[PDB]
Amino acid sequence: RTEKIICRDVARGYENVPIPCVNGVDGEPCPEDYKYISENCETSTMNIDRNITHLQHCTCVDDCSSSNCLCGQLSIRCWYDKDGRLLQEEPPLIFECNQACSCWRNCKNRVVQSGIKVRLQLYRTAKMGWGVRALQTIPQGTFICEYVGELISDAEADVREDDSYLFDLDNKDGEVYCIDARYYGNISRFINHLCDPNIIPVRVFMLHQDLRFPRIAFFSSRDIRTGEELGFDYGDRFWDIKSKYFTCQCGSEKCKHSAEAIALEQSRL
Amino acid sequence: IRTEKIICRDVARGYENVPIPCVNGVDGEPCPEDYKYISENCETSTMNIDRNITHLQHCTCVDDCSSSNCLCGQLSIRCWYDKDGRLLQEFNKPPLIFECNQACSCWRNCKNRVVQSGIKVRLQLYRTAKMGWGVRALQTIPQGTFICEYVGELISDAEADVREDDSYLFDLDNKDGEVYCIDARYYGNISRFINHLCDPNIIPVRVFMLHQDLRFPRIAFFSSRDIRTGEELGFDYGDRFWDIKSKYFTCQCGSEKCKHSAEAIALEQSRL
Ligand SMILES: CCCC[C@H](NC(=O)c1[nH]c2c(c1C)C(=O)CC(C)(C)C2)C(=O)Nc1ccccc1
Ligand SMILES: CCCC[C@H](NC(=O)c1[nH]c2c(c1C)C(=O)CC(C)(C)C2)C(=O)Nc1ccccc1
Ligand SMILES: Nc1ncnc2c1ncn2[C@@H]1O[C@H](C[C@@H](N)CC[C@H](N)C(=O)O)[C@@H](O)[C@H]1O
Ligand SMILES: Nc1ncnc2c1ncn2[C@@H]1O[C@H](C[C@@H](N)CC[C@H](N)C(=O)O)[C@@H](O)[C@H]1O
Ligand SMILES: [Cl-]
Ligand SMILES: [Zn+2]
Ligand SMILES: [Zn+2]
Ligand SMILES: [Zn+2]
Ligand SMILES: [Zn+2]
Ligand SMILES: [Zn+2]
Ligand SMILES: [Zn+2]
Ligand SMILES: [Zn+2]
Ligand SMILES: [Zn+2]
């Protein structure tokens, strides 16, 4: 079977680079049951707090590479190196520089807000439907893409029927919100769960600091080779609900969510 | 004899598509720093802008949106872009632009994306002889070319009334309901330095892009004629401004048909 290119760019030119779609597995057409958006949307009143005087911000006159940058000090247990790659030492939290900072738009603390830089491809997997893979080598710590979708309350997320694209922001101070990528989403909605994952989600603040709405940035957790499928750990909560409908097909020797692994965890408990 | 110094390589700190340098060959005034440069409008208290994606009118085009079937063009009061991104000649020199948005089926590089694609001409902030800072062209700018947006702090009409300095206050002129302003005094972009000319060469146009909350048009400047390198950019601030301000200073634009100079004022006062 010939792997045919079925969309030159599922993002319709909204990302820094195209994201083409191919299918060398079956006859499934390019997915169109959703609306591709490159930034989060709302379908009810969220009214994100963008008040420029609510932004914590730095006074740096350099490129924000010094530990004196307030925005880097606000970042929790993570930092960017000279090449824009994320290092880590309570989940991490990135405060990037913003429009209130004295610094320039190309300072060293602007990785996620500068967008996709790696070449990605939407492709048909053997067993998991559509997936996303790298078309280049990707060093550990590189920004990949943002989890983009429809902002909704936890109460709204609880009542939605198709929860296969629901990302819980897990707010700890205030009410809990979610990103639902079912009806509106970007390339991240197609990233599958892997028990041997190679990317990690990290909460980030950029042009607003409304604590209801951290934005979700995926970074590679190791060097990724050309052609490798991207995947992250969806988490135990996801599988505790979805394993009633399907079990994990990642096929890894490390797999923790197969029928066999679930049965073995139930006997271990 | 004073020669020209470059005193800032980019007043926008890299936030625009191109740098906007500041020069002064007239006096010792330093690079203006009594404001915060922002490349897009801000709020200091919420305006509750309607950003619900389902409220957007949007098109179904999969070409470049150059056909008469594009709903977004049909909304626009076809004004109006040509294949080069310029306003048409017979464009009404009021106009309203509905650009394509994130709900449209077209690509981000369609023909109805001019203002949202940002500054493309080369501009310079420079010290004028008699009007403080001004903005001039560093290149030929054909008629109808997008120049820049009037960017600042979105405020209510009531808030605009209580503010001390109104020299950077732009009224959005909502003929319908609630009235809002863009105040570029504390937060603004390069447009806050564009002076009044009685022979203007740019015009403001109301535009909608990522939202269609009709209370909050964004203000886009387009050239109204071919502009040559070195010409100062200017629009007609309007009589409402001058009816108030002419008691405190008169127009220094130097036009042969200046309407707001001491000479013109003296003529109008004697006619009455
Ligand atoms: C589909 C997206 C991934 C599945 C989805 N995952 C998450 O929501 C999620 N939230 C967080 C993480 C993760 C993986 C983190 O790693 C850390 C954090 C601070 C960023 C918070 C999830 O559980 N859906 C879910 C839950 C219940 C029912 C149905 C679907
Ligand atoms: C300083 C910014 C330009 C001066 C300022 N101009 C405007 O507000 C303004 N509003 C509109 C226009 C203009 C020129 C239009 O051409 C058409 C429109 C639909 C875009 C609406 C204005 O009068 N300030 C003012 C008035 C009185 C006191 C203090 C300040
Ligand atoms: N490890 C996995 N094992 C089995 N199915 C998976 C796995 N990871 C993701 N999926 C499938 O993909 C859905 C999650 C989606 N966000 C991922 C994109 C999805 N593959 C698609 O074609 O749209 C899940 O509900 C599953 O149907
Ligand atoms: N035609 C003009 N004649 C005299 N003063 C002007 C004229 N146009 C603009 N100004 C001055 O500039 C102010 C408007 C500002 N938005 C323009 C930038 C201003 N020149 C500055 O240096 O900051 C007015 O309140 C005047 O002080
Ligand atoms: Cl320059
Ligand atoms: Zn800094
Ligand atoms: Zn910075
Ligand atoms: Zn900063
Ligand atoms: Zn697995
Ligand atoms: Zn169209
Ligand atoms: Zn459109
Ligand atoms: Zn379009
Ligand atoms: Zn004049």
XYZ file of C-alpha atoms and ligand atoms in Angstrom:
664
model
C 0.000 0.000 0.000
C 1.246 3.462 -0.984
C 1.422 6.076 1.781
C -0.552 8.925 0.213
C -0.354 12.598 1.204
C -3.954 13.634 1.828
C -3.536 17.134 3.275
C -0.638 19.529 2.726
C -1.330 21.278 6.040
C -4.113 20.427 8.491
C -3.394 23.766 10.207
C -4.279 25.812 7.084
C -1.143 27.922 7.462
C -1.818 28.960 11.067
C 1.382 27.422 12.480
C 4.973 28.454 11.789
C 5.328 25.284 9.687
C 2.883 23.057 7.817
C 1.587 19.861 9.395
C 0.771 17.485 6.525
C -1.398 14.375 6.822
C -0.614 10.972 5.301
C -2.264 7.568 5.462
C -0.374 4.460 4.432
C -2.510 2.081 6.506
C -6.146 2.164 5.380
C -8.826 4.096 3.508
C -9.725 6.511 6.291
C -10.118 10.063 4.935
C -8.379 13.078 6.413
C -10.122 13.823 9.746
C -12.669 16.630 9.487
C -15.067 16.046 12.414
C -13.386 18.950 14.247
C -12.302 22.530 13.572
C -8.545 23.118 13.574
C -7.678 26.156 15.714
C -4.142 27.181 16.574
C -5.060 28.968 19.841
C -7.603 28.169 22.549
C -11.198 29.260 21.995
C -14.294 29.743 24.114
C -17.930 28.919 23.335
C -19.289 30.527 26.523
C -18.206 33.525 28.590
C -14.714 32.887 29.914
C -13.479 36.485 29.540
C -9.832 35.753 30.241
C -8.218 38.304 32.543
C -5.765 40.082 30.241
C -5.411 43.267 32.307
C -1.871 44.375 31.556
C -1.503 45.678 35.118
C -2.242 42.172 36.460
C 0.905 40.787 34.812
C 3.935 40.094 36.911
C 6.830 41.121 34.722
C 10.576 41.709 34.668
C 12.753 44.807 34.331
C 15.712 43.150 32.562
C 17.761 45.212 30.110
C 19.495 42.097 28.752
C 18.064 38.991 27.065
C 16.611 37.586 30.323
C 19.354 34.964 30.570
C 20.237 36.051 34.125
C 18.812 34.507 37.282
C 17.775 38.049 38.254
C 14.896 37.965 35.740
C 11.696 38.065 37.790
C 9.863 35.899 35.244
C 12.472 33.161 35.570
C 12.224 33.390 39.354
C 8.442 32.993 39.123
C 8.913 29.806 37.097
C 8.560 26.744 39.339
C 11.316 24.122 39.106
C 12.146 24.668 35.424
C 14.159 26.954 33.149
C 15.211 27.397 29.517
C 18.779 27.068 28.245
C 20.460 29.156 25.542
C 18.835 27.095 22.764
C 15.314 27.363 24.164
C 15.221 23.827 25.584
C 13.442 23.180 28.879
C 15.259 21.821 31.933
C 13.648 20.648 35.169
C 14.491 19.903 38.773
C 4.853 20.050 42.839
C 4.467 20.064 39.046
C 6.556 22.612 37.150
C 5.115 25.927 36.023
C 6.629 28.208 33.370
C 6.176 31.973 33.475
C 7.362 33.305 30.141
C 8.049 36.977 29.550
C 5.144 39.090 28.367
C 4.036 42.444 26.970
C 4.544 44.144 30.357
C 8.211 43.113 30.649
C 10.883 45.626 29.726
C 12.660 43.024 27.592
C 12.517 42.413 23.848
C 10.251 39.977 22.043
C 13.274 37.751 21.300
C 14.510 37.340 24.878
C 15.442 33.858 26.155
C 12.156 33.337 28.031
C 9.761 33.200 25.031
C 9.846 29.604 23.796
C 6.202 28.523 23.934
C 4.814 31.846 22.733
C 7.038 31.615 19.635
C 5.182 28.530 18.406
C 5.911 25.278 16.617
C 9.406 24.871 15.196
C 9.737 21.131 14.587
C 8.363 19.310 11.549
C 5.413 17.123 12.576
C 3.134 14.835 10.596
C -0.403 13.601 11.188
C -0.395 9.953 10.141
C -2.500 6.809 10.376
C -1.246 4.393 13.047
C -1.663 0.630 12.850
C -3.935 0.293 15.891
C -4.730 3.633 17.564
C -6.352 5.634 14.773
C -4.568 8.842 13.826
C -1.322 9.795 15.521
C 1.431 12.390 15.334
C 5.071 11.688 14.505
C 8.308 13.620 14.061
C 9.766 14.235 10.596
C 13.142 15.221 12.085
C 15.371 14.424 15.020
C 14.311 16.336 18.139
C 16.671 16.864 21.098
C 15.513 16.352 24.655
C 13.774 19.403 26.084
C 12.542 20.858 22.780
C 9.152 22.549 22.555
C 6.862 20.443 20.343
C 3.348 21.949 20.370
C 0.596 23.267 22.638
C -2.530 21.384 23.703
C -5.128 23.697 22.126
C -8.897 23.418 22.343
C -12.146 24.758 23.781
C -11.973 26.212 27.300
C -14.739 24.762 29.493
C -15.560 24.492 33.179
C -15.094 21.247 35.090
C -18.884 21.082 35.464
C -19.232 21.306 31.682
C -16.482 18.725 31.172
C -18.299 16.324 33.504
C -21.416 16.292 31.300
C -19.823 16.012 27.858
C -20.351 12.661 26.171
C -17.143 12.388 24.103
C -14.336 12.734 26.642
C -11.549 11.363 24.394
C -10.001 14.827 23.975
C -10.558 16.305 27.466
C -7.492 17.794 29.179
C -7.992 18.699 32.848
C -5.952 21.726 33.886
C -6.159 20.531 37.530
C -6.306 23.997 39.112
C -5.362 23.952 42.788
C -6.287 27.525 43.812
C -9.723 28.352 42.414
C -12.226 26.589 40.208
C -11.103 23.832 37.834
C -11.162 24.264 34.055
C -10.523 21.982 31.099
C -9.406 22.141 27.485
C -11.796 20.082 25.336
C -10.239 19.434 21.926
C -13.140 17.326 20.631
C -14.856 19.984 18.501
C -12.088 22.602 18.292
C -8.454 21.584 18.607
C -4.994 21.657 17.097
C -2.480 18.933 16.170
C -2.185 17.877 19.829
C -5.659 16.319 19.819
C -4.185 13.498 17.719
C -1.274 12.647 20.054
C -1.839 9.185 21.517
C -1.080 7.792 24.960
C 2.213 5.937 25.265
C 3.295 3.966 28.312
C 6.860 4.684 27.115
C 6.247 8.394 26.443
C 8.620 10.825 24.768
C 6.903 14.162 25.489
C 5.585 15.755 28.683
C 2.949 18.455 29.279
C 3.974 21.565 31.218
C 1.735 24.423 32.378
C 2.802 27.842 31.071
C 1.748 31.474 31.355
C 2.515 33.921 28.555
C 0.395 36.909 27.556
C -1.969 36.617 30.538
C -1.668 35.332 34.085
C -5.277 34.303 34.650
C -4.760 31.347 36.962
C -7.898 29.608 35.682
C -6.124 28.992 32.365
C -2.552 27.741 32.304
C -1.694 26.818 28.734
C -0.344 23.318 28.096
C 3.041 22.992 26.359
C 4.520 19.665 25.291
C 8.291 19.262 25.458
C 10.296 16.204 24.476
C 11.465 14.187 27.487
C 14.302 12.520 25.551
C 15.963 12.678 22.160
C 13.391 11.710 19.516
C 14.376 10.074 16.229
C 12.911 10.832 12.816
C 9.664 8.956 12.252
C 8.981 8.234 15.938
C 5.389 8.564 17.080
C 4.949 11.262 19.712
C 3.078 10.298 22.846
C 2.572 11.349 26.431
C 1.254 9.713 29.593
C -2.482 10.459 29.618
C -2.427 9.540 33.308
C -4.102 7.008 35.577
C -7.327 9.006 35.868
C -7.934 8.782 32.109
C -7.423 5.018 32.093
C -9.467 4.410 35.242
C -12.452 5.685 33.243
C -11.670 4.624 29.669
C -10.419 1.071 30.304
C -14.085 0.049 30.557
C -14.261 0.763 26.793
C -10.768 -0.106 25.509
C -7.355 -1.028 26.878
C -3.915 0.209 25.919
C -2.452 -0.822 22.561
C 0.878 1.004 22.822
C 2.485 -2.430 22.542
C 5.448 -1.525 24.738
C 7.071 -4.002 27.091
C 6.462 -1.330 29.750
C 2.713 -1.079 29.095
C 0.710 -0.321 32.256
C -2.827 -0.113 30.852
C -3.353 -3.304 28.846
C -6.033 -5.779 29.857
C -3.238 -7.914 31.287
C -1.697 -5.036 33.248
C -5.087 -4.014 34.659
C -5.820 -7.579 35.776
C -2.363 -7.825 37.353
C -2.817 -4.503 39.151
C -6.178 -5.689 40.498
C -4.566 -8.819 41.938
C -1.646 -6.772 43.295
C -4.263 -4.628 45.072
C 24.288 72.869 13.007
C 22.787 69.733 14.506
C 23.095 66.381 12.780
C 20.821 63.409 13.194
C 21.388 60.795 15.899
C 19.798 57.345 15.972
C 18.576 57.148 19.557
C 16.672 53.836 19.478
C 17.038 51.013 16.999
C 13.467 49.769 17.578
C 10.906 51.485 19.787
C 8.791 48.330 19.466
C 11.474 46.080 21.084
C 11.037 43.471 18.353
C 7.246 43.128 18.677
C 6.484 44.311 15.119
C 7.337 42.593 11.846
C 9.999 45.253 11.235
C 12.041 47.526 13.506
C 10.842 51.088 14.045
C 13.893 53.246 14.802
C 13.812 56.652 16.481
C 16.063 59.523 15.347
C 16.516 63.154 16.356
C 18.319 65.768 14.306
C 16.426 68.749 15.750
C 17.033 69.044 19.499
C 18.190 67.157 22.577
C 14.900 65.403 23.291
C 15.654 61.769 24.232
C 13.830 58.722 22.957
C 10.273 59.015 24.330
C 9.855 56.775 27.360
C 6.805 58.253 29.143
C 4.596 55.445 27.818
C 4.729 51.673 27.427
C 5.053 50.443 23.837
C 2.555 47.668 23.104
C 1.994 46.115 19.692
C -1.664 45.133 20.344
C -4.481 46.765 22.301
C -4.550 46.283 26.060
C -7.020 46.508 28.934
C -6.418 47.771 32.466
C -9.922 46.790 33.547
C -12.026 44.313 31.642
C -14.133 45.385 28.671
C -15.810 41.949 28.488
C -15.044 41.671 24.774
C -17.209 38.991 23.146
C -14.687 36.340 22.065
C -17.137 33.438 21.701
C -15.961 31.633 18.553
C -19.528 30.627 17.714
C -20.544 34.287 17.387
C -18.134 34.903 14.483
C -19.510 35.308 11.014
C -17.127 33.386 8.796
C -16.657 32.207 5.237
C -16.606 28.780 3.555
C -13.910 29.559 0.956
C -11.090 27.141 0.231
C -9.442 29.391 -2.368
C -7.690 32.652 -1.464
C -11.001 34.446 -0.664
C -10.785 36.592 -3.799
C -14.224 35.571 -5.077
C -17.522 37.349 -4.497
C -18.730 34.246 -2.617
C -16.622 35.116 0.434
C -19.100 36.004 3.186
C -16.449 38.037 5.018
C -15.956 40.230 1.965
C -19.730 40.489 1.571
C -19.905 41.811 5.149
C -17.404 44.571 4.478
C -18.942 48.008 3.959
C -17.084 43.214 -1.201
C -14.397 48.644 0.757
C -11.863 46.007 -0.464
C -8.685 44.547 -0.772
C -6.953 43.953 -4.088
C -4.575 41.126 -4.923
C -1.646 43.085 -3.415
C -3.339 43.728 -0.063
C -4.248 47.332 -0.847
C -7.581 49.080 -0.495
C -9.307 49.595 -3.839
C -9.137 53.004 -5.510
C -12.923 53.629 -5.379
C -12.836 52.654 -1.708
C -14.898 55.120 0.322
C -12.270 57.624 1.493
C -17.794 55.158 6.695
C -15.962 51.954 5.742
C -15.949 48.772 7.791
C -13.660 45.769 7.209
C -14.475 42.203 8.268
C -11.272 40.238 7.776
C -11.245 36.459 7.822
C -10.858 34.810 11.206
C -10.230 31.525 13.008
C -13.752 30.239 12.199
C -13.335 30.636 8.415
C -12.475 27.577 6.359
C -9.768 29.444 4.403
C -6.031 29.477 5.091
C -4.223 32.040 7.247
C -2.647 33.576 4.116
C -5.831 34.375 2.199
C -6.399 37.798 0.622
C -8.602 39.035 3.498
C -5.885 39.133 6.212
C -4.103 42.458 5.657
C -4.447 44.182 9.027
C -4.033 41.030 11.104
C -0.727 40.340 9.287
C 0.867 43.441 10.786
C 3.202 46.217 9.738
C 4.982 45.721 6.419
C 6.168 49.225 5.454
C 9.305 50.786 6.912
C 8.513 53.705 9.260
C 10.649 56.009 11.374
C 9.896 57.910 14.563
C 11.649 61.264 14.168
C 11.833 64.705 15.750
C 9.899 67.302 13.758
C 10.701 71.000 13.667
C 7.447 72.197 15.235
C 5.135 69.289 16.138
C 7.161 67.228 18.589
C 7.689 63.636 17.558
C 6.246 62.469 14.255
C 6.285 59.397 12.026
C 7.645 59.381 8.474
C 7.950 56.894 5.642
C 11.289 55.230 4.883
C 10.059 53.972 1.507
C 7.558 54.607 -1.238
C 4.115 53.566 0.008
C 1.529 53.043 -2.761
C -2.003 54.314 -2.232
C -4.171 51.892 -0.269
C -1.315 50.237 1.633
C -1.824 49.226 5.259
C 0.445 51.335 7.467
C -0.192 50.495 11.120
C -2.937 50.103 13.710
C -3.988 52.695 16.288
C -3.075 50.669 19.393
C -3.632 51.610 23.017
C -5.638 51.041 26.167
C -9.336 50.216 25.679
C -11.443 52.392 27.991
C -15.065 53.356 28.491
C -16.440 56.744 27.541
C -16.866 57.605 31.229
C -13.211 56.753 31.915
C -12.059 58.877 28.972
C -13.950 61.840 30.454
C -12.003 61.817 33.731
C -8.539 61.489 32.184
C -6.037 64.335 32.391
C -4.168 64.118 29.077
C -6.418 63.456 26.067
C -3.749 64.130 23.394
C -3.672 60.395 22.552
C -7.398 59.617 22.899
C -9.131 58.015 19.893
C -12.932 57.730 19.871
C -14.237 54.611 18.121
C -17.470 56.526 17.239
C -19.985 53.729 17.826
C -23.100 55.102 16.123
C -25.159 52.403 17.879
C -24.658 51.576 21.554
C -21.976 51.707 24.241
C -19.135 54.139 23.492
C -15.480 53.162 23.920
C -12.109 54.784 23.258
C -8.505 53.794 22.664
C -6.263 55.868 24.934
C -2.651 55.688 23.759
C -1.326 57.966 26.542
C 0.044 55.279 28.901
C 0.124 52.265 26.554
C 0.425 52.648 22.790
C 2.271 51.788 19.595
C 3.896 53.868 16.837
C 0.513 55.404 15.893
C 0.446 57.534 19.047
C 3.164 59.684 17.431
C 1.331 60.288 14.137
C 0.514 63.991 13.887
C -2.441 65.814 12.382
C -2.064 67.002 8.791
C -4.555 69.235 7.004
C -3.274 67.559 3.831
C -3.464 64.007 5.214
C -1.928 61.003 3.533
C -3.409 58.211 5.693
C -6.958 57.405 6.808
C -8.321 55.373 9.732
C -10.595 52.429 8.926
C -12.569 50.334 11.413
C -11.698 46.629 11.162
C -12.746 43.349 12.769
C -10.435 40.336 12.928
C -10.298 37.797 15.797
C -13.587 38.987 17.324
C -16.695 40.716 16.029
C -17.754 42.571 19.153
C -19.113 45.652 17.372
C -18.352 47.878 20.368
C -14.613 47.405 19.713
C -13.541 47.967 16.116
C -9.799 48.067 15.710
C -8.421 51.112 13.906
C -6.246 50.537 10.834
C -4.424 53.292 8.932
C -4.169 52.960 5.143
C -2.444 55.384 2.805
C -4.854 57.621 0.882
C -2.328 58.444 -1.868
C 1.117 57.369 -2.979
C 3.576 58.439 -0.268
C 7.260 59.125 -0.960
C 10.278 58.337 1.218
C 10.716 60.976 3.889
C 7.147 62.281 3.909
C 5.600 62.696 7.335
C 2.547 60.503 7.863
C -0.586 62.203 9.105
C -4.340 61.886 9.255
C -7.101 64.421 9.825
C -7.664 64.394 13.588
C -11.057 65.984 12.844
C -12.839 69.171 13.873
C -13.955 67.797 17.252
C -10.303 67.620 18.308
C -9.433 71.068 16.959
C -12.574 72.789 18.294
C -11.187 71.909 21.748
C -7.440 72.078 21.178
C -7.123 75.238 19.054
C -7.483 77.394 22.186
C -4.182 75.888 23.413
C -2.135 75.432 20.235
C -2.665 75.960 16.529
C -1.894 73.717 13.579
C 1.716 73.760 12.386
C 1.230 71.473 9.370
C 2.211 74.193 6.895
C -0.372 73.257 4.260
C -1.376 76.020 1.871
C -4.955 75.037 2.802
C -4.373 74.574 6.534
C -7.695 74.774 8.362
C -6.507 75.142 11.973
C -3.614 77.620 11.923
C -3.661 80.920 13.777
C -4.133 82.471 10.337
C -7.136 80.249 9.591
C -8.575 80.809 13.072
C -8.273 84.584 12.739
C -10.178 84.396 9.439
C -12.979 82.280 10.917
C -13.322 84.539 13.967
C -13.658 87.588 11.708
C -16.181 85.927 9.381
C -18.408 85.549 12.447
C -7.068 13.419 26.203
C -5.972 14.256 26.858
C -5.087 13.449 27.819
C -5.852 12.730 28.938
C -6.192 13.702 30.111
N -5.036 14.150 30.854
C -5.075 15.247 31.670
O -6.142 15.844 31.772
C -3.892 15.731 32.382
N -3.962 16.878 33.174
C -2.774 17.177 33.741
C -1.848 16.223 33.293
C -2.543 15.316 32.430
C -1.962 14.141 31.719
C -0.443 16.266 33.725
O 0.390 15.470 33.376
C -0.031 17.404 34.687
C -0.926 18.648 34.615
C -0.561 19.614 35.745
C -0.660 19.412 33.313
C -2.411 18.294 34.669
C -7.298 13.079 30.964
O -7.041 12.637 32.062
N -8.570 13.062 30.425
C -9.750 12.484 30.951
C -10.018 12.281 32.313
C -11.188 11.670 32.733
C -12.125 11.222 31.809
C -11.869 11.398 30.465
C -10.698 12.012 30.049
C -5.354 61.791 19.122
C -5.967 60.766 18.190
C -6.607 61.401 16.970
C -7.607 62.515 17.295
C -9.003 61.916 17.697
N -9.714 61.366 16.594
C -10.716 60.445 16.736
O -11.015 60.109 17.870
C -11.392 59.868 15.572
N -12.395 58.897 15.712
C -12.870 58.484 14.503
C -12.166 59.189 13.515
C -11.229 60.062 14.178
C -10.264 61.008 13.515
C -12.458 58.983 12.079
O -11.888 59.565 11.185
C -13.571 57.993 11.724
C -13.767 56.879 12.773
C -14.959 55.969 12.391
C -12.508 56.004 12.762
C -13.951 57.461 14.167
C -9.772 62.964 18.513
O -10.683 63.589 17.982
N -9.361 63.152 19.831
C -9.815 64.101 20.773
C -10.963 64.891 20.608
C -11.323 65.846 21.555
C -10.549 66.049 22.682
C -9.399 65.297 22.853
C -9.039 64.353 21.907
N -2.441 3.853 24.058
C -3.629 3.789 23.400
N -4.239 2.590 23.218
C -5.401 2.512 22.559
N -6.000 3.610 22.069
C -5.430 4.829 22.223
C -4.223 4.941 22.897
N -3.891 6.252 22.913
C -4.864 6.937 22.264
N -5.803 6.056 21.846
C -7.034 6.389 21.084
O -7.032 7.791 20.782
C -7.977 8.504 21.575
C -7.342 9.772 22.152
C -7.125 10.887 21.118
N -6.900 12.114 21.864
C -5.897 10.594 20.245
C -6.166 10.726 18.741
C -6.943 9.527 18.180
N -6.024 8.415 17.961
C -7.672 9.869 16.898
O -7.555 9.114 15.897
O -8.427 10.873 16.880
C -8.409 7.511 22.645
O -9.769 7.708 23.028
C -8.251 6.174 21.951
O -9.358 5.927 21.082
N -0.815 69.620 13.186
C -0.328 69.820 14.434
N 0.029 71.053 14.847
C 0.512 71.262 16.083
N 0.657 70.249 16.955
C 0.324 68.990 16.580
C -0.179 68.749 15.312
N -0.442 67.430 15.218
C -0.097 66.859 16.401
N 0.363 67.820 17.236
C 0.865 67.643 18.621
O 0.906 66.238 18.922
C -0.151 65.859 19.812
C -0.859 64.592 19.322
C -0.016 63.317 19.475
N -0.955 62.204 19.390
C 1.008 63.199 18.336
C 2.462 62.957 18.787
C 3.138 64.199 19.399
N 3.660 65.070 18.346
C 4.267 63.820 20.325
O 5.385 64.369 20.185
O 4.041 62.997 21.239
C -1.064 67.077 19.850
O -1.739 67.191 21.102
C -0.104 68.222 19.626
O 0.639 68.563 20.811
Cl 16.003 50.305 10.712
Zn 13.636 39.245 32.292
Zn 12.264 38.590 28.831
Zn 9.897 39.024 31.791
Zn 0.478 0.892 27.059
Zn -13.507 33.708 2.253
Zn -13.491 34.482 5.945
Zn -10.213 34.046 4.014
Zn -2.915 72.463 9.283
